[PDB]
Amino acid sequence: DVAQLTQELGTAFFQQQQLPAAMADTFLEHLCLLDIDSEPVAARSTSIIATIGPASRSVERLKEMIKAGMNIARLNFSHGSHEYHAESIANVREAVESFAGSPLSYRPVAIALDTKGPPGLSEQDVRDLRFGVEHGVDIVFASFVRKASDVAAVRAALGPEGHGIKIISKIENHEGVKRFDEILEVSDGIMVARGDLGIEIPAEKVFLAQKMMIGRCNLAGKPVVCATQMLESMITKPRPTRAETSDVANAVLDGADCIMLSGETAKGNFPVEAVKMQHAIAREAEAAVYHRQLFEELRRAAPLSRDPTEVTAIGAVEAAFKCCAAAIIVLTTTGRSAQLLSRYRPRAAVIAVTRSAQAARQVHLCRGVFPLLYREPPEAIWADDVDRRVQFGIESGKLRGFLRVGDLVIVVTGWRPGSGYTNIMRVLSIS
Amino acid sequence: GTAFFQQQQLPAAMADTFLEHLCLLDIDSEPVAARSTSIIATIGPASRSVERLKEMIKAGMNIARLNFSHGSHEYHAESIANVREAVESFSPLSYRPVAIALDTKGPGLSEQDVRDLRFGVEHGVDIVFASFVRKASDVAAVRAALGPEGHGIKIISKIENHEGVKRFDEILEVSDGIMVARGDLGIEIPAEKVFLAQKMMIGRCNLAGKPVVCATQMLESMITKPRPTRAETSDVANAVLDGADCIMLSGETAKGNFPVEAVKMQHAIAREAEAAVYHRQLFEELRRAAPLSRDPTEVTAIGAVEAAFKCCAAAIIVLTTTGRSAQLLSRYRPRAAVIAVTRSAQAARQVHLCRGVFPLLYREPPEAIWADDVDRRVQFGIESGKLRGFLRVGDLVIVVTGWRPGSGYTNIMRVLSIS
Amino acid sequence: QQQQLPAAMADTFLEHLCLLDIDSEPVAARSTSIIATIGPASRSVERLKEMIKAGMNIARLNFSHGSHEYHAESIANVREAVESFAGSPLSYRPVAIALDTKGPPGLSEQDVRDLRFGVEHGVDIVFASFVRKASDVAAVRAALGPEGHGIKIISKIENHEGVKRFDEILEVSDGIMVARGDLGIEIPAEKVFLAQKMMIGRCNLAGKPVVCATQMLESMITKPRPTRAETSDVANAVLDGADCIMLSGETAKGNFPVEAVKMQHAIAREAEAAVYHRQLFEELRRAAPLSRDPTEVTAIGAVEAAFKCCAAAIIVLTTTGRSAQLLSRYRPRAAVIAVTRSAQAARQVHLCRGVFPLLYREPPEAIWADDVDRRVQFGIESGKLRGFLRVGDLVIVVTGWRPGSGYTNIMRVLSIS
Amino acid sequence: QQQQLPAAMADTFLEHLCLLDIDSEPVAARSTSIIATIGPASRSVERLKEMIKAGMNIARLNFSHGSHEYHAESIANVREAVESFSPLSYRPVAIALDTKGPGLSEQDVRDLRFGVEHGVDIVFASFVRKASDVAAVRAALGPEGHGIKIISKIENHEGVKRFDEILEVSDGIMVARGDLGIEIPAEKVFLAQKMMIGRCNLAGKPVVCATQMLESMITKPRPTRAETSDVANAVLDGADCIMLSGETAKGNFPVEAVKMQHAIAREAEAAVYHRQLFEELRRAAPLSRDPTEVTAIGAVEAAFKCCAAAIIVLTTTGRSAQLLSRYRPRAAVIAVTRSAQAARQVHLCRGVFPLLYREPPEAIWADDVDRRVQFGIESGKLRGFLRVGDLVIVVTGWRPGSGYTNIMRVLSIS
């Protein structure tokens, strides 16, 4: 089963990243084999959303948070003025662009606008959504979404210039949970807003709503965010409680694409340490996912597909598991081909090469997608331009530790230019 | 009738995959089964009053923990007396036994631990939570310090450091059960690795059929606040979903301002989480991993649990002298409540360590005809079950008994209709 | 390790196949009953004694040939051969008598007369030819008069309509026969295996007996050894889930009737050990609906307990055979030793795979619990004499809480002393 | 629905059996190859043409009987019949030499040399009892016989007991039930057959089920119920090939025997429970860093996701098609090759349909690869494998020559 690859890659490789637990035949055996001495090796795949506020607004502090692992900056429009939020956005952009001198240092960071909330779309939300479009935000976290028409109202308020902005619906009350299917259908993703949910429904039922919503989003292949009070005590203390570390680990094990920090980064005394703690827990929890059952169940539950991007994605993930591929390099214009690979939860990192700065920021919503922004002008021959981008992903991957000489990588491309034509999977040996 | 299959997450229970099971979990599907995960409450100034202890017993406290890292022997003797007074204040059909557990100060075996363990035997404690167990010889030392008079006391080894996790298998083999002592574990190993040690230890204890306790900071914010954080409710629910037999409260009940509410909160979460367990996979995996056995108690237990699942039995009523027959039923995680009828006050207290075991203390002297004595105890289990809401007329129950008096002879399973 | 136990412990069906071993000898008693057709080659009392010793459990009388007088003589000869072993408990074996009708536009006049002959001669089973719909079964049931309601009706599926209306036929029948001879002429020959596998699967799911019939060892009508396809066919019928396997021309007119019975016995024993019980039991459990019938609930608990301890046997007390049939439906590896006072139920339970009938004729004890104990001990002592059990073995015992049929609700684990 | 698709979607093997339907017609092309023994009843060119049309894929020459001159004439007649057949529909037919048997006999050395000189594709080596027997056959084939496939016949107790060492050095196995049924108890042959088929399926190597499959058809026009069951169960067991011996070599109904195996195999292939089979084969196949192996599992997974009508693969030696076949896709594996020997030999692998490419070469290697893929599509449409609107998976490599398969592409037809 694993004997030839154990001889080739070594016993040390197979003792890391919870690989003994990954090879177990049952979920019970998988738990029994989890090992505190089995170190994570893969890059952290669950994105961290940090709320920006008084403790995390300065350019110097934002540079530290980007280095600690922040992928998405959340602006809570329930507090502060438009002037206050515009300055936060400018500071985030200055900190992000301070690393732009090279693909080895650059890390795209998405900007998300979290609305104040509502009897339908409020007048303040209309003004805040217009502010978001004018300031080029990547994502909207829509507060108190209760039905599909609430999403349509947010979409209309973004106007024709905001068509590319992702709408993540926040489920915060009983109606949102009950009408979940209709809301998910029209949203780009979901946020389990546990703060309000824990007041709107009995506190002892929140975990059921969280697990159900994460499961349904995983089945739909749409991003899901777990939010609120994940590391709450870290607002005043340098180390979290045992329940808080457990909560972050279990959100990742449940299947969350993103985890969030609110007061921990907006007002707390340890914003950088809170990001570092979520980073450390998420890497441990990602390695502990039982991929054997998860991949089997995602295949069994997902309907058959005639979409070549979907068909190539499952073949690429299956191939990555067969050879313990270090990465899956994918070319993408909108992020969709990377999202379809992410839905099958590969252990291999999905390195997404794109010319779209906005798609590079938005793909942080999908677990395990590492965006690489390609800035070179197009080659005269399209096939050469595709090859250059694949080589850019390989060289960036090698220079950044994702790839090593001798590794196998899976490369996912399409047959013609433009979004929607991904249909090729190639197995390449890194030299 | 019809609403039965809507409740207790039964639509999610019938799912063909774990992913579909999650997708079918419903916040409107109310729990019906009695809460199976026992609650351990640490005794302290917030919970020493006899009147406060009566409220904690009513709220759901099953085991009272005495932390010997604080207070003198005189202090702990008063704690024991107050717990016993509150427990004995309670109507034999509704009486709830409450175990007393002694949690040692810790270290080899210290001289203070030798004195504290002798105090425990002299005061009749049921369980010892042995601190900082690092190897099998630590358990043997605790057992020797309990002496010949403490042979019946259960030893739960607390795993609190790297060595304890690494030598886990040898420790589990000689212990009655384990406690995942997350407080010290979270200081001894990186905080971000504690969940791995917790999940591994719970999985291994579930495989071994031995009790496992999840402990420390589960509802920490309720020491000062009336409602817990979202991470705390998640932590309690995930400990139950992981497979913990018991969950614990430390500062929340010993020194905080909401000891009764903290017990009520663990009770409420545990009931919701138990209904959300995917028994289809869990039972299949426990059966597959459990070795073949020639012990009639073990063979009867798996047959009884299989029968209970076939008919959606409301309960499995088992007669037990030491608690062993109830423990062997519990290891297969039936959805049916295991109602354990015993004359041993100590066994009635100790079986709270096993998930889904509801002990009933039978006080009547033995009937002259042994089959009549067995029947009267089964009827006592039924009448208690009806009064407490476990059973109703028309329910099916599985009754587990043995072929002769004395411990060790369980060998019969019977399907009974409640009249 | 014997009885394919290394293959039994495999985690996948593919691994199970890879671990099958020609040197792993079968130990369990043969569980699939053998039905032999009685005719010119197998009618004599001396030949019938050899067929009983070789393993024949059910004698089939084909009413498409011969007179009532001819068949009455065959029945008398079978009964004389069976009773010749009534002095030795080690060799006495009940043998069922099955009447196979000539067939039909509805119930034929000849079938009414032949079914009446069956009732008058005390036959145990009817193999009803060309059953095409539920009303055909109702007609056979009505023709079984006021005296034969206890006779089992096994519907023969022999044409396209019978296959298409299978669910309605199975619902009203006691069991099914896959009558491959006519089926292979009525539908394309290359589709018969699909109908066979589907019908066996559905009968296994319903917990009703299914017989695989016709041309299983055909070449043995003239040759002393079968072809490689014929041994394969018998083994695959057992692996498919057939409760019984049948011989027609091989025993009725062939030159090697005893050898044909011996060959089916030898193959069935090898094939039964090769069954992948791990998957079979899991799938039977998952597909069977929840039940509030204590006999059904006790049966699954007893089979689960037998697997847990590798029990040598499950001893069950039964008056009608129903408690043994409900144990058989879960396909335990342990032999189901059925202790009954009903001579008819003892003959009829041969239709259920793995049921070994023991006819008990002691007068009833005044104290019911003592009468139950005496019968359980009779099953144990017969099991020891026949090689099923030894001192130290574990056995599962299934009984009810009060006398009379329909109250099975107890499972006990006993250590043999 | 057709091709037992209701049974294919079942959640358990038991439910799969319950859903099998005699009215659900097979649509896929027959995947299990038929080996027919050539003899007096099937030697003529006219008879051989009818056998090729009926479905014969491999012609077996039994060197236990007849002279070298007799077998050379049989080979010439098979080749004349094959070459009588339109490049988009041409069907390659392999020639297999079945040795007399024993260490290596002097007669076998002469017969193996005859085989090399006459360009046989396969050797069915009789009575293989250990790895050194396979080495001796390989040595007797010499340097000119390097490309010939050796299928070891397991015929006795020793061969069964030393099976793993024999399989390791052989190209495949034949379950030679005739001798096996005399060497071991007849009632144990099914265990040896099921074990050997299971182990060959795990190893990804061809396995042949042989002897007395349709025996009664030597004198009768229709087989017995046990014979149709035997053929169906060999396919369900996982056999890559099924064989006819006396039925085609000396019987009165050789063509009808081939037609009967074709009809049963098609029905049995649709009745395979792919949901369990693919999951088990995928789980048991070892992890690998070989790009052909990695591409093969990705291609089979992709084919199942979209209900692909076919997987078109370019192959020089047949290896890339064999690695796809080992995962038992429901999609036909259309193997496009320029090697006539590889086209003949790939009949040993279930579900591989060889197409011998004889179109003019393109100047640009990438255009030449594209035209070979288009040839597979056009041939597929003509033969009924593909229709406009179908999805196909295409498996190719990054450079010319064997061993470089590393690409899988999803293509919509027309």
Ligand SMILES: O=C1c2ccccc2C(=O)c2c1cc(S(=O)(=O)N1CCC(C(=O)O)CC1)c(O)c2O
């Ligand atoms: O907070 C912790 C803790 C934190 C970090 C690492 C380990 C621990 C720990 O082990 C622990 C804790 C608290 C208590 S207590 O219930 O508050 N209490 C019982 C007795 C006294 C009282 O009656 O108040 C004082 C202590 C424990 O009993 C206990 O074991």
Ligand SMILES: O=C1c2ccccc2C(=O)c2c1cc(S(=O)(=O)N1CCC(C(=O)O)CC1)c(O)c2O
């Ligand atoms: O030759 C007699 C016979 C001769 C004189 C007086 C009585 C009989 C007689 O009773 C009898 C005979 C033959 C057959 S059979 O060859 O076993 N037959 C072949 C296949 C049949 C089928 O495809 O359905 C069913 C079975 C019987 O079944 C049967 O009972």
Ligand SMILES: O=C1c2ccccc2C(=O)c2c1cc(S(=O)(=O)N1CCC(C(=O)O)CC1)c(O)c2O
């Ligand atoms: O090769 C000839 C042949 C050559 C020259 C002159 C005459 C003949 C001839 O008459 C003949 C041949 C082969 C076979 S066979 O069917 O292959 N045979 C069946 C038994 C074995 C098996 O079960 O696998 C394989 C051997 C015959 O049956 C047969 O009659």
Ligand SMILES: O=P(O)(O)OC[C@H]1O[C@](O)(COP(=O)(O)O)[C@@H](O)[C@@H]1O
């Ligand atoms: O993930 P998306 O948005 O569908 O983009 C995938 C597209 O990227 C490509 O690989 C390259 O296209 P471009 O040259 O237009 O960037 C296409 O072949 C493919 O259709």
Ligand SMILES: O=P(O)(O)OC[C@H]1O[C@](O)(COP(=O)(O)O)[C@@H](O)[C@@H]1O
């Ligand atoms: O669970 P344990 O300690 O083995 O006790 C089970 C015992 O209880 C009984 O059911 C009743 O025994 P007693 O009448 O002695 O209480 C025995 O038949 C059986 O052996």
Ligand SMILES: O=P(O)(O)OC[C@H]1O[C@](O)(COP(=O)(O)O)[C@@H](O)[C@@H]1O
């Ligand atoms: O299988 P059946 O026909 O329902 O018979 C089972 C019956 O056998 C018994 O075990 C013994 O009953 P009898 O004493 O009347 O033979 C009953 O308790 C049970 O109801």
Ligand SMILES: O=P(O)(O)OC[C@H]1O[C@](O)(COP(=O)(O)O)[C@@H](O)[C@@H]1O
């Ligand atoms: O299956 P094999 O023998 O490895 O052949 C596969 C080879 O066929 C090809 O697809 C085409 O190669 P050729 O152009 O030499 O025919 C190669 O890219 C690949 O390596």
Ligand SMILES: O=C([O-])C(=O)[O-]
């Ligand atoms: O709005 C939120 O983020 C919440 O309620 O958790």
Ligand SMILES: O=C([O-])C(=O)[O-]
């Ligand atoms: O001792 C304890 O309970 C701990 O450290 O958690």
Ligand SMILES: O=C([O-])C(=O)[O-]
């Ligand atoms: O009647 C039968 O037995 C048959 O046709 O197979």
Ligand SMILES: O=C([O-])C(=O)[O-]
């Ligand atoms: O050699 C063979 O083919 C046989 O014996 O079956």
Ligand SMILES: [Mg+2]
């Ligand atoms: Mg909110």
Ligand SMILES: [Mg+2]
């Ligand atoms: Mg501690």
Ligand SMILES: [Mg+2]
């Ligand atoms: Mg008839």
Ligand SMILES: [Mg+2]
């Ligand atoms: Mg007929």
Ligand SMILES: [Mg+2]
């Ligand atoms: Mg031979």
